[PDB]
């Protein structure tokens, strides 16, 4: 019946991670893609005044 289940372990120990860049590779994907991606960024704002 048993060999159907396992062992062992554990293991947290630290967690306090951030900004790095190395831990900032882990906390992200997106924020790395986005990281190129930002501001908001363009144009136009002038009409809105001018009016």
């Amino acid at each position: 019946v048993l060999k159907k289940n396992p062992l062992k372990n554990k293991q947290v120990l630290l967690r306090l991670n951030p900004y790095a860049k190395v831990f900032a590779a882990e906390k992200l994907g997106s924020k790395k893609a986005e990281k190129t991606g930002t501001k908001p960024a363009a144009v136009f704002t002038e009409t809105l005044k001018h009016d």
Partner: protein, 239 residues
């Protein structure tokens, strides 16, 4: 001895199955980067229709009283609630509603959504609390340091590994950027998203810029009460 050793190789497969997920996340993250652009711009976009419509609006308004006719903006905004004030000299009353929001101690935090009913319940809580909308970014900074792990496991933080691979999530994507976007938009079962793990346990403010007087309201000139701008400043200090 040979045969269990072959079982150890299989663990290299498990090493692949999540990574196949990693690749899925990279894509998800790329789509959700455009979803980030929208969260930032939306507030800005509302303002454009007023601006476009009205030359009239500004000059009359600084100089004199009266208001002009034609348009008007409605607004939603979700909230974040932090308990400044302690238990001492209060009824259990109001305390049992704190326990309901899940502000267990001072420098506890809970997010709340946009509605009149919460506010009315929040009114009994009120002299417990500074509250307001923190912006898209300060909330990102808020999750990273203060967030914690779910039940069926203890406290394990919101830190990098633990969100990407773990965190339950029936409704939608748990991953760090996806989860944060999704609560702020306050769409479907983002109230189930805001069934966080459970309270953010905030640091005391540095410099006491987070503490203007406990005595006072934002109208008295203190900390108390609703304030969007000040809550983002306040949370930065809670770091």
């Amino acid at each position: 001895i040979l045969t269990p050793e072959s079982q150890l190789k299989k663990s290299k497969a498990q090493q692949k199955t999540a990574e196949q997920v990693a690749a899925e996340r990279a894509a998800r993250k790329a789509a959700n980067k455009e979803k980030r652009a929208i969260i930032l711009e939306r507030n800005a976009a509302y303002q454009k229709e007023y601006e476009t419509a009205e030359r009239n609006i500004i000059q009359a308004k600084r100089d004199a009283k009266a208001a002009g006719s034609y348009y008007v903006e409605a607004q939603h905004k979700l909230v974040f609630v932090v308990r400044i004030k302690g238990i001492n000299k209060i009824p259990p009353k109001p305390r049992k509603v704190l326990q309901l929001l899940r502000l267990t101690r001072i420098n506890s935090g809970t997010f709340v959504k946009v509605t009149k009913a919460t506010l009315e319940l929040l009114k009994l809580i009120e002299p417990y609390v500074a509250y307001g909308y923190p912006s898209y970014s300060t909330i990102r900074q808020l999750v990273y340091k203060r967030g914690f792990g779910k039940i069926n496991k203890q406290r394990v933080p919101l830190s990098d590994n633990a969100i990407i691979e773990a965190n339950l999530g029936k409704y939608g994507i748990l991953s760090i950027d996806d989860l944060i976007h999704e609560i702020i938009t306050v769409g479907p079962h983002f109230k189930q998203a805001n069934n966080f793990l459970w309270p953010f346990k905030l640091s005391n403010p540095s410099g006491g810029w987070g503490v203007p007087r406990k005595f006072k309201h934002f109208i008295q000139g203190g900390s108390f009460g609703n304030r969007e701008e000040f809550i983002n400043k306040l949370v930065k200090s809670m770091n």
